Structure formats: C-alpha cells, structure tokens
RNA sequence: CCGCGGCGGUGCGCCGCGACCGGCUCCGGGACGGCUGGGAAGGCCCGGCGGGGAAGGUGGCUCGGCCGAGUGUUACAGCCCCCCCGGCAGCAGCACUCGCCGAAUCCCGGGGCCGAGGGAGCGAGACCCGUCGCCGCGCUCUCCCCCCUCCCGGCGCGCCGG
RNA sequence: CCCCGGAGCCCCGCGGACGCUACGCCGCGACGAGUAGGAGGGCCGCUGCGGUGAGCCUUGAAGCCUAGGGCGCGGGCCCGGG
RNA sequence: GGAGCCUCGGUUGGCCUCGGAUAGCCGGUCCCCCGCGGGGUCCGGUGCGGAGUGCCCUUCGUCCUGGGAAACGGGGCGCGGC
C-alpha cells in the first residue's frame, strides 16, 4: 500500500570528456554511495516514469497518461555508488536529474 | 534394476576410475560367447468383391507446399521446460515469511509452503489475516524474509500442481463476429474446492502462527519503503 | 565449430586431454583428505585445550 | 627491448596460452584448435600429435 | 526535499563545488547566510583578488560587460554559476533551482539548516591559517547592508533563543515524563534495548 | 467439426520465466610447494654470564592528602630490554589477516552483463531421424545381501514384499 | 554365405539435389585509412538505333507535386494520392 | 457540488539556539547580580556526541464482537473571543 522503489537520479550518459555512448546510462541510487555497498542493486529492473499527452494503455487497470521506459542495471561505476544501466530504449536526455525507479525484484536474496 | 555404482564426485567426472569400476561391474567372467519383392508390407484392410483390398496406412499426402525450409542440426543440448533442473535459493524454507512484491498482492507477507513441480512458489497468506489464496509465486519476484515457522508436521494436499493451477478460458468454435466472443460475461467463479483446499490448509497454518507473538499483526500488516530506510542498509 | 574453452569445459579438456581426468579427480580427493586431516588435527587441538 | 615485454614465463602459464588461445597454421589459416587431429595430421611427422606433446 | 545550508563558516569554493553538483543532481538547495562564509588566505590577498576582479571591466560599454556584484549571496551565485554549464539549458535550470540569501529569511530562519563538515573551514584549514570573511570583504568593496543584516540577525538570535528556551522546557516535561511512566512501559522500554535503542 | 495427437513457418502488439553454451567482470571457500628446509612471535620455564634505559628503594626539591604525582642523582633486578652456553607437541607466510614468490606444488561452488543465427532426407508398400569424435554412467545377457521405503498388497502409528 | 524396385543406413562403388542463372552455389582463414593517381563492378542515371517482351496506354502516356509505403551501403529505383 | 482539455514535477515529514575547535552539551540553582526569565561561582552526568541527522516523529489493510493494560481524548475545512 506503499512505495515500492528506491530513489534514484539519472545523472547522465556514459561519456568521456567529448564524447558520449547514449545507450549506456548512469545511475545514482539515493542511500548507497561506495562501490562496497551497490552490489545489491547488481541487476535491479528499473524505469524511467513520465507522462504525455495522449493516452496510452496499462495493464491491470484503465487507460492512462503515464508511460515507462524500461531497462536493467547492468553494473557499477566507479567507487561512489553511482551504477551503470542500460535501457531498452534510449532516455531523451531531458531526464537529467529526475527520478528514475530501481525496482526490488530480480531479487536473488 | 541396480541404481547407480559410483557416487557423484563431481558433476560430470565419475569418483573411483576406469579399473575400480571395471572391477564392480565385473565385466570379468561376462567374457560372453556370442558371435522383399514378392510379400505385401502392411495392410489392414477386407472387402467382399474382388477378394481382399491391398489398402495404405499412412498414405502419401495430396499437396505439397512449393517451398519448404530444410532440417536442423539437433541443437545438441537442448530440454524441455519439463525436463530441467529446479533451484532453490538459500534463504528459501519450507516455514519461511516471504514479502512478494509484484502483482496486485503487493507487499505482503506471506507463509511459504513449498516449491512446487514447476519451478513456482506455492503461497498461501492467511485468508482471514493478508487476504491471500492458494497462489504461486517465483523466486525472482520475492524477497525471502528471514522468520521461520515450525511448519513439517502438516498435510498439505497433493492434488494441487501446476496443472491445478491453470486457466481455462479461451475457446475456439464460437461464432465471433458481432458483440461476442469473450468481451461479455465479465467474471470468473470461485470454484469452492479451492474454497476448501483453502481451508484446509489455513486451518492448519494458523495456529501454528498464533503462537508466536504479534506474527499475525506482522502478516496483516504491509511492506513498504520509506524515508531514510534503504534494502543495502537494513537487513531481513 | 565453436572454440570452447579447455580451462572451462571439462570435456572438451578430455577431448584434448584424457588424463585431466585423473588429475582433476586428484585434488578433489587429496584436498579432501587433507581437510579431513586438518579438521583431525582441529579437534585434537580443542581435546588438548580442554584437557 | 623498448617495444616489448618480455620473460620466461611458467608451466601454468604455457597452460593457458595454449588451451586458451590454441591457434595453429594449417594450410596458412588460424584454425583453433578443437581436436588433437589437427596436430596429429600437421606435426605427425616430428613426433608431437597432441596438445600435450606440444606443450611438453 | 529542499535542503538548507548554512553559509557560516564554510568555504567558499569548497562549499560552492558541493552545491553546484548537488543542484546538478536535481535537488533544491537554498544556501542561507552567505556572509559568514570564510576564504581561506588573509584579507588582503582576498581583498586584492576581488579589486583586481573589479578592475576586468570592459572598456567600451561596462555596463553591457562583466556584472560586478557586491553583495555576499550574489557573490556565491556568481562562484557557483562559475562551476555551473550555465551556457546550457540544465545549467539554467540549476541557476534556476539554487536559491541564496543573504542573512537568512522568514521563509527560512525557522528551518533546521544543514552543515558540511567537507567544507567547513575547522576541518579543511589548519588552525594556525588566515582567513577573510565574505562579509567583511563585501562591506569594504561596497556592500551596503552589513549593520542592517547584523540588527535583523540579533532579532532573530533572541527569538531563537526565546525558542530554544521553549524546546529546552518541552524536553525536560519529556525527561520528566519518561521518569514518571518508566514503571507503566516496562515492557516497552525493553523492547527497545533489546534490539539497540536509548543504550 | 472434436483432437494444441506428430512435423514445419509461427504469433497483432507489450512482456516475463526456465535451463544450456560462448565471451567477460567479481565473490565465498577448501587444501599445496619453496624459503635462512622461512624471520620474529604464542606456552611452561630451567642452571649459569655480561651490558644498558633507569624501580615495592635510597634521595635534593616541588605540588597535595603515614600515602599519591613530577623532576634529578650512583645503580644492582625484586620495572624491564639485548647477547652466549642447551631444548620441549604447537604449526600451517596462520580470519591474533606482521610483512613474499607462487600452482599438472590447484580445485570447487555462487552472483551480475552481453550475444545465439549455422541448418549433412524434395524416395516409389518400408521412421519426415537420429546424431559424428571425447569423459562417463544405468539396465540386460552373472548371482547375492543391508537400509530408507513411496503407487500397491497383508498384519498389529510400527513391520513385512519399482 | 542370396538380390539392396530395396541392407534400411551417418553412407548407398545400383540411378543419384531441395543446393547447379557452373559468368552459379557453398565452406574456412586473414584484412579493411587516404589526397594526386591507377584499375575493376554497376540489375545507377540521359539520348538515339538493331533485335526482343502475343510489353504498357484516353477504363488514362510522358512530365510535375507529395505531411504516404518502401528497397538498395550508395549512385538511384518501385508503388499509393492529386 | 460535475465530467471534461493542456502542462508537468512527485511518491511521509522534521515547526528554528547562538557558539568553540588546545573544547563543548545538560541540571538545580543551597550562593550572588540584573530585567517569571537571563547571567556569574561551586557541584553532579555523558563527550568519537543515545537530550545521537549513524537522529527524531506518523503507520501504510478494512470492519464485525468481547476481554485485558492505558486514556477523557478526537472530530464536524466546528462556531465566537484572546
Ligand atoms: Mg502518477
């Protein structure tokens, strides 16, 4: 009856100094902040929800605004907790800094 | 009828040898000393003029599709689904509280009975605590919470499987064109020996769960995250 | 065909190699006796602690 | 020396560098090496028929 | 979901470099009383570094070139709109998220504001260092409200005070209320301890 | 037409799961070799021997309540440290993680990601298919025996016979 | 100690494609930068001619426009509407 | 009190002392001063902070009836006043 997901943030692509793989995406999941403590999240289905105008379908319910974009968080990046995903289509690069849901079930403990 | 002579070491690799096991299945003293055009194939078939009719079981089709894809190479390793391996995760007990996290039971908590033919969870909730049926799971979905019920002195039913649980619907012959075909009668029954089953089982589930204290409350009540609690941080 | 790999397939290793069988029979038994000498020597040690 | 790392590498390592990466010259062609026959028929008139024999 | 930092006694660009990569990460951060903000090297290396600052000036039209802005909380805009892609649309976005104050508001001075020890002047510099405060620094370049700030933040002081004194009423009612019901929740005090709370 | 009975391409779209392989990236364990045939260390200390910082002392002073703390003065051993005469399982480069080289003197199990694309029956009465090389193993053509025994049978929850 | 109008087989020395525009099909291995320049292939494009399609067409040719469906790496091409 | 268009972010909140870094937090104030409160002296409790942001606060299934511990609490965007 309550929330599902934990909080995370789309901090941007995987990108050198000038360049940039748009089909990789960084993540950084709120509370985890070591390479130590992000093994859990190791391959955690996660989503980017928005919304548009015309309406869509949704399974189990009525037809909606809401829309997804789903993906899977393939491993981590870099000491400082930020996680690496890649999505199954590409995030529009207006997401920069809203949420993004890390689910709890491809759960393997 | 003898069962298997060497144990399993490894998986794959046989434990004593090629000549211990020469020595066990004693393949000394089994040194053993051993070294159409006119005729009808098959038919079945009688007739009363003409004498008896030659017929064809089997018979050679009447169309040929004029293109075809050819053979394959036998895949050389594949199973079916009914033919795998089933896994068990570590912290999954027969006794064990499960939080299942993806269906319209979501959150809950729920006694866990055992793993079934199929690789799915059986779930049974407490019907007068979580409001939850005789349902499967799957493993990926669940998260295994760490409390376990004394469980192993009940009798669950054994007619209840993967082909128990299985829906019905969808059938071909009807007429479908017009308003029909599935878009109407809006329900699915109950079917009360699931009723009973239900019973059944919870009836012996409880009180062995409302002995220990407040793991009612802990059943009926409903998983959540919240601020500042996080699943690499707490543990279960 | 498919190159697979020897160090990680344990019968292509016998394809090319028929005696990795005997030597991966060896240290899983001789390991294993020697765990079962040191699990030994473990319990004599907590026997002379507790005399 | 500038261009190069060099060593005398060991028993294990020989291991590896030939079940791993067995590539052989047969015909002028980098063919793997998944089956003894291939040895057997390029070096079986020098004594070594197997990736044993070649290692050794 | 809007933290609230202090600007007393923490570093300029130490805390600047924090905020932007904060506000980078799509979080509102309102960074209040930015003239208790220190910078480490004494006051008249800092002076001369901003006169030198005022002097960069464009020669045909300064007021169509660089905007010299003297107070404290502009000065900490502009030290974070200088780590900030300001030139993009999400760095315009950040500018627009970042709130600062100078002194700290009705809005905010009745919040509990944050304090970064990774920026913060008794963790970063060794005690036998210089220092210049921002407030200091803005008043003898120009600024013209250091007295005004500094009556409306005694105000405030007495009224925190005055609130403080309340809290430290309403917690010792709590103590002695605890002391009274200790006999009545003794079962529920344990069940606490037991699993690693008020020990 | 009722049959998803067998084969083949498959599905209108969105998906999920299982097992197996190839390439990777990590984790938890187990046991082995060499050394100065490891160095110091852990335990009981024994009969001697020399030297040095300076202690339930001696003792100039200071600070307090016969007692405690600091400083300095000769310096024994009853605070300790180092070296020689000589010896006991007690060690595993050790989860008392003090610092090496490592592996036919080496192996097991697990977690995460990516991909599967190649198709050796186009026969008229005879199967629209298996499999080739490697490690095995189960049955049978040799015969017995013990235990758990579940579909089933018998007797009073227990016992007896695929 | 027999024949395969059929031993029935991972191979059929008895005729032998679904696979064969042999200028075709198929299987491995390595490689792939480029100006000036050189060579090869165009079922890329324009115009006219000798053959050829029992070719197309007032029940609508060429040309032109297109917020449509596409194909080819590409040169470009085939349809849908006016 | 009503559907119906457009644009989106979200997924409990924290309603507050100043202050020092070679120190600081909390008491009664038996003792004193100043305008019930503040300040000073002595004393007592913790100080890698449990009067802890490594923190605190709210439960996030429902209703039926019939007991125990606790409670005179809550509500009608409750009406008028300070
Ligand atoms: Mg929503």
């Known amino acids: ?109 | 009828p003898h069962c298997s002579r060497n144990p399993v070491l490894v998986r794959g690799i046989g434990r004593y040898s090629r000549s211990a096991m020469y020595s066990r299945k004693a393949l000394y003293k089994r040194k053993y000393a051993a070294p159409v055009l006119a005729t009808v194939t098959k038919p079945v078939g009688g007739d009363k003029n003409g004498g008896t009719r030659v017929v064809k079981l089997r018979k050679m089709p009447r169309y040929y599709p004029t293109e075809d894809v050819p053979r394959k190479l036998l895949s050389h390793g594949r199973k079916p689904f009914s033919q795998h391996v089933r896994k068990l995760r570590a912290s999954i007990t027969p006794g064990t509280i499960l939080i299942i996290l993806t269906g319209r039971h979501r959150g809950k908590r729920v006694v866990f009975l055992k793993q079934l033919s199929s690789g799915l969870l059986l779930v049974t909730g407490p019907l007068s605590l979580n409001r939850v049926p005789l349902r499967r799971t799957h493993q990926k979905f669940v998260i295994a919470t760490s409390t376990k019920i004394d469980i192993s002195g009940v009798k669950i039913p054994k007619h209840l499987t993967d082909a128990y649980f299985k829906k019905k619907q969808l059938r071909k012959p009807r007429h479908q064109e017009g308003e029909i075909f599935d878009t109407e009668k809006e329900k699915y029954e109950i079917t009360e020996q699931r009723k009973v089953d239900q019973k059944a089982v919870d009836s012996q589930i409880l009180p062995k769960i409302k002995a220990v204290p407040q793991l009612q409350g802990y059943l009926r009540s409903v998983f959540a995250l919240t601020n500042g609690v996080y699943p690499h941080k707490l543990v279960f | ?51 | ?56 | ?199």
């Open chain 5, 1 to 199: 979901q809007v933290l609230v930092l202090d600007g007393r006694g923490h570093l300029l660009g130490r805390l600047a470099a924090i905020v932007a990569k904060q506000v980078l990460l799509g979080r509102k951060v309102v960074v209040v009383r930015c003239e208790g903000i220190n910078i480490s090297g004494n006051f008249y290396r800092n002076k001369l570094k901003y006169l030198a600052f005022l002097r960069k000036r464009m020669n045909t039209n300064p007021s169509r070139g660089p905007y010299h802005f003297r107070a404290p909380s502009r000065i900490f805009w502009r030290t974070v709109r200088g780590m900030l892609p300001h030139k993009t649309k999400r760095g315009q976005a950040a500018l627009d998220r970042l709130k600062v104050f100078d002194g700290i508001p009705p809005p905010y001075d009745k919040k509990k504001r944050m304090v970064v020890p990774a920026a913060l002047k008794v963790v970063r510099l060794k005690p036998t260092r210089k220092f210049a405060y921002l407030g200091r620094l803005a008043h003898e370049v120009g600024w013209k409200y250091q007295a005004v700030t500094a009556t409306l933040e005694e105000k405030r002081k007495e009224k925190a005070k005055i609130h403080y004194r309340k809290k430290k009423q309403l917690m010792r009612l709590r103590k002695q209320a605890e002391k009274n019901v200790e006999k009545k929740i003794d079962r529920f005090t344990e069940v606490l301890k037991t699993h690693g709370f008020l020990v």
């Open chain 4, 1 to 56: 020396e500038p261009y190069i790392a060099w060593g005398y590498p060991n028993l294990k390592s020989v291991n590896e560098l030939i079940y791993k990466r067995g590539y052989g010259k047969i015909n002028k062609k980098r063919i793997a090496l998944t089956d003894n026959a291939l040895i057997a028929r390029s070096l079986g008139k020098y004594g070594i028929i197997c990736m044993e024999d070649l290692i050794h």
């Open chain 3, 1 to 51: 065909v498919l190159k697979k790999n020897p160090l990680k397939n344990l019968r292509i290793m016998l394809k090319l190699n028929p005696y990795a069988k005997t030597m991966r029979r060896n240290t899983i038994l001789r390991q294993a006796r020697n765990h079962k000498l040191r699990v030994e020597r473990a319990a004599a040690a907590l026997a002379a602690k507790s005399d």
């Open chain 1, 1 to 109: 009856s309550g929330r599902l997901w934990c909080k995370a943030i789309f901090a941007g692509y995987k990108r050198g100094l000038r360049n940039q793989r748009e089909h990789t995406a960084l993540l950084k999941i709120e509370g985890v902040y070591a390479r130590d403590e992000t093994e859990f999240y190791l391959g955690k289905r996660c989503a980017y929800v928005y919304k548009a105008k015309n309406n869509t379908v949704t399974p189990g319910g009525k037809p909606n605004k809401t829309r997804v974009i789903w993906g899977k968080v393939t491993r981590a990046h870099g000491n400082s907790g930020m996680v690496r995903a890649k999505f199954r289509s590409n995030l529009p690069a207006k997401a920069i800094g809203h949420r993004i849901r890390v689910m709890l079930y491809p759960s393997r403990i």
